[PDB]
Symmetry: D3
Subunit: 254 residues, 6 copies
């Protein structure tokens, strides 16, 4: 598959996915969604990639939105399918068995907010903006926004942001817990690489399985969630990395 | 019904609902609950109401608890029933297809905290306090408190509050996410109206369906939640507002 | 059973449980978990005990992890069993029908973070640290970490903490809601005891039933949750406490 | 409220609700749905009614369907509301705190199948037919059918009946567990009255609370469901009927 | 502990547990529940035991109810506690990591129905009867009845059985899936033992992990359920049994 | 892709998919799974396919297990992965917006039982058998068996089958609801086509949305489920087929 709107780069144990539609401020569309699905595949096909960073081209936009020309003419049944497909790709991102960090370098609006929310971790530049303008365009959020925002920052804030369609600055995104950290633009990528390298310095199956345990156990009652964990915890004791690391830990007396 | 404890008004497309019992610091009682039921009903039927502000008369109080005289003589089967009827009113408010803003202007305690939590959005004046004193009275929270506080502020704070029965102030309410914002007493209704108007300026089917999606999807696993979203998203494409707002936006975007 | 990792004391109506392995930094091993279960069962039968405070001993540690010697040679099926047994002990603490306050007096890592997350209310001293080292050792959290953290601090932060395995100070911990308060070492137990003491002054059946409604209601959808509450609320009307606190309250306030 | 299309009769401890649009084979419509909501109220307002029987007028139809003239012109947003309202009334029926038995005397198609499925218990005459024709009319079931049928007879059969829109006879309804018993037309009402009188010879709060425990606990995980039961079980020991009946049971030695 | 309501025997790799209160019709009282919990814990630690058969003694009764003398004077809070303790015993049986077969040899009412529903597999003798008398005594089921029956036989039938309190014969019981088989008295234990024996010939880790996946997966949504399975499936690949059964199977079948 | 183990055909608007490996009794293997993935994909894209029949070549077999040679050498982390990939294919089939009919014409064991259960509707020839032998091979069911059988036939039968590893015949499959119907071997495809054609004769958006509602609503509490229905119901009123089928029906009804 050819790659017009997205850049995959690999080096060491981390991949960087860069949305790159510099004219339309990195907005999503049919094609850019297909390209993202494809790269998610590449990434899951490679077991030497242990952590991902998703970012936007340039200094102004992470992902501005989705293309409205594409959406304006759709009927009920088409829009529904268009919702299912974007959700398919973002859900795939969320479940991807490597950690994905969203390096939110500017505008994250609409589908851009939604795709950032689909990552494991969000950090922002100080210039970053977050919002869901969809309801001013006569629609709901369409790529999960009605679900991941409340789960991430609580019903109170989610509802306000979604019903008003008003943006918030980086500092406020931090106050409500939508991002984990805020830094200066010139520090964004270094900070994501440092978090990514800490993650990748850890044991991959444990990170892999911990991600699954959090993602899945969060969907259900606490007793079945906790059982889920012990099953995954068991699996870890079948690996080299488990014995080696617990061993070298006990090289503590030296 | 002629209302004695509740004032219902319409400014623009926003309903303003005010609990007013100056003898009792706007405390709930049966009568007040039945009046509130009635006005939620009126607001349901009124296609000219697109958003709601819920508030309390006066400067001291939002809603300060609930009439204890009505409750003292109840047996187990009567208390049960009383908890069910109150919860019903509040659930009904929670689910109202118009968004609801609690403008918390004073004491919000017990039932008062509970009715506020049953709104979509809570904003507060700096003198406001929130608490659940029920456990000092020999009872649990009975109008959804054991369920809604937890969900809105987490298990740690909720358990602290319900178990100690101690009030918090607005700055703390804000810190733990119980409210989205805190402002001076004389800025409260203005900020509420500014929120309400921005909501009302948006596509109403979209707002209505975003609220449903949020309310309902939050109850279930993410996969079914995301699927609910797409059915609601699709319904929006049956509307003029969507066709019109998008057309407008593409043209104006230039 | 006779105890040499865990002290248990009863001060009027509150029990203080202190994990005491000073040289091991109060770390958890099988004997410790076993004794914990015993003391929990002991507190279960003592109706003079209406609240619990859990802390560690000395001034360096709450609980610093779990014994890696017991773990290093475990295999998949034994790993699993370990996980289940720990979780079974911690889950019993979480459900315990008296409120339990973790006074986190210092290091709280891995299993120690997990035990603290298994209490009702967390409170910390400004020296405390929190973390989940597990993935550095080629394992996932094994005593609930993958489930409780994300539930308490949201997915963004839980995922960052578990994938990176880096620690945070008590101030970060309060910011993300992991704890409800930070005080200085010298204030910790007084703070815990004054929280415990307020709890103990309130009606005991009401606090009990509240704990249950919050735990059980939090697992399911809001409608069946709300209905759970009313059944519990009803039960409070069978007690004398309800009759006397509400008779007192009327006359008292006048 | 006036009652054109529905008959409420009370005698002893049982109410009989009779759908009675003999011309349109007892089909539902806006008005008949409002009338059903009203009678549900009357019934819940009367504590001497301990069991309900829902049936259709005449010997041919239980409830044939809903009126299609009413539905044909609706748009997306109207149909959605029309779905919510019918579901509101049937859900109210399902939760009504007295047992409701559906005496299915003939055709139960569409909304008729759906309203029968909303009762606690179904019994049929041998001439009864069951089905969901909606998908041949260009719609889904609209009054719960997509939910109660699978829950009642399993996904396999529900899907077949719903995707094909083909009817099944009484004997087959019995084989898949959609009804509990099949009898001759001249025996239908006697059999429903006998089941109703057995129910009503039992202790009303226990039946009341058992209904709630089944309805609610079925919605959630088994641990929170079982906790739900014990709360309700507790409530029972606060009643006369509990002590009297256990006492008179132990008059067993006579 | 030494046992005088419950016999426990070990036949190669299967344990037979027999409730033995011949004169009381094997009824459950607190001492019996207590001993059951003890024997369950005893079977828990015995890894030579890979399956369990539960039955009653003599030819009239499986378990006929629970002792109403212990219950008659209980109040709301004590009722509740009783319910929780029974359920806690039965839930431990349900989750027990060896399969358990109820050989229902006769009467199985109230608590006795409930204990049988708490095993993995039910099998009955043609004389057996099933039922839930509780509502005749002014109580709901107290040891899981309100939850397990509807889960096993569907809502239609569970509701009829609990609201009416009437019993059914073993043939009705098989029809509705309450039991998997009916045999004559003389065949019962052979049938159980041959089921137990097949189970015991199969790989033990696989049966264990299957029991867990079925119990825990059944509580949540299909996607997190499916993911639970794969984690367990993975664990099977850590065992020698998997390696040897699949090496055998190839060569064997040729 | 050129297919070696799967035959894909179109008769009318129905796709017929046939698993065909005469050397191996149509047993699954990796290759066969990838081919099945591919054809589910083709069927997704084909707007001319409105229903699917899944079957096996020959007279002995539907799908008889899965290639054990591929599995024997796997470690824990590889087995996990293998279970995930298989489940994915099957989930994808389960969720396909065209209904799927398993025409079970012979042995359906292990993977074979599992793929059949992942269809919407199961019909069987009288010589058919169903079973899960995985536990004799040292493994759990790994393609959703621990989850789907339970849901389709109940916990009692599912646990019996998975634990014993014993096959049942078609008459028993029918009795426990695993299949909707059983017919002679030479009537099987005819009955399947008759089902498929009746489905296909219906309004396709309605069928498609009924399937979603059923799949998704079954995962959650009834209240949110019913709400999902109404969003889907409403979408149908955006379609001609609804307008047309209703008009037609009102006119023809006369």
């Amino acid at each position: 598959m050819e790659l017009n709107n997205v850049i995959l780069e690999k080096e060491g144990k981390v991949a960087v996915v860069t949305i790159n539609r510099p004219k339309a401020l990195n907005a999503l569309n049919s094609d850019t969604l297909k390209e993202m699905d494809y790269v998610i595949g590449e990434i899951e096909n490679d077991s030497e990639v242990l952590a991902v960073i998703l970012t936007g081209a340039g200094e102004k936009s992470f992902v501005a939105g989705a293309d409205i020309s594409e959406m304006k003419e759709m009927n009920t049944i088409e829009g529904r399918k268009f919702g299912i497909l974007g959700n398919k790709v973002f859900r795939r991102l969320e479940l991807l068995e490597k950690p994905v960090i969203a390096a939110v370098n500017g505008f994250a609006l609409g589908g851009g907010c939604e795709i950032a929310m689909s990552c494991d971790i969000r950090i922002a530049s100080s210039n970053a903006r977050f919002g869901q303008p969809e309801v001013g365009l006569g629609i709901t959020p369409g790529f999960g926004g009605t679900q991941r925002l409340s789960r991430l920052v609580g019903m109170g804030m989610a509802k306000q942001l979604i019903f008003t369609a008003q943006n918030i600055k980086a500092d406020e995104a931090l106050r409500i817990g939508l991002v984990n950290k805020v830094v200066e633009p010139s520090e964004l990528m270094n900070t994501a690489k440092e978090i990514a390298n800490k993650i990748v310095s850890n044991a991959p199956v444990a990170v892999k399985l911990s991600k699954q345990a959090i993602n899945r156990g969060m969907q259900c009652d606490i007793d079945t969630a906790l059982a889920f964990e012990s099953e995954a915890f068991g699996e870890c004791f079948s690996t080299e990395d488990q014995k080696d690391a617990m061993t070298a830990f006990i090289e503590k007396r030296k």
